[PDB]
Write a structure and sequence with these properties.
This is part of a larger assembly, with three copies of chain A. The first copy, chain A, is an all-alpha fold. Chain A contains two helices and no strands. The longest helix of chain A has 7 residues. Chain A is flat, with a radius of gyration of 9 Å. In chain A, 3% of the residues are buried. Chains in contact: A-B, A-C, B-C. The interface between B and C is medium-sized, with 19 and 23 residues. Chains B, C: This is Transient receptor potential cation channel subfamily A member 1.
Chain lengths: 34, 39, 39
């Protein structure tokens, strides 16, 4: 969760591909921060 | 009035150098190793 | 007219500090570990 909020906020594209290999997973895809 | 005008030219490239640097700073973050800070 | 002239001296080293920094920023990119970003 917080890794994805970190990695997507800085363009770290390869870990962004790595965390999003989980299929049919959307709850953490659109979760918000504080 | 000539003195301020060359300072503006000396400032315009100065920020231009910084914007090239600031884009370069993002490239460190774009490609770096972070395995200790798993968080 | 004395006030603007010391600002030019205070600006001339300021960009000079930045050019030394900007060359130093390239050295991070010149020597860094990038194994996660295979791309």
């Amino acid at each position: 969760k917080s890794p994805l909020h970190f990695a997507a906020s800085y363009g770290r594209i390869n870990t962004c591909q790595r965390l999003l290999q989980d299929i049919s997973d959307t709850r953490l895809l659109n979760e918000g921060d504080l | 009035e000539m003195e301020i005008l060359k300072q503006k030219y000396r400032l315009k490239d100065l920020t231009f150098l910084l914007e090239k640097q600031h884009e370069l700073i993002k490239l460190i973050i774009q490609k770096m190793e972070i395995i200790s800070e798993t968080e």
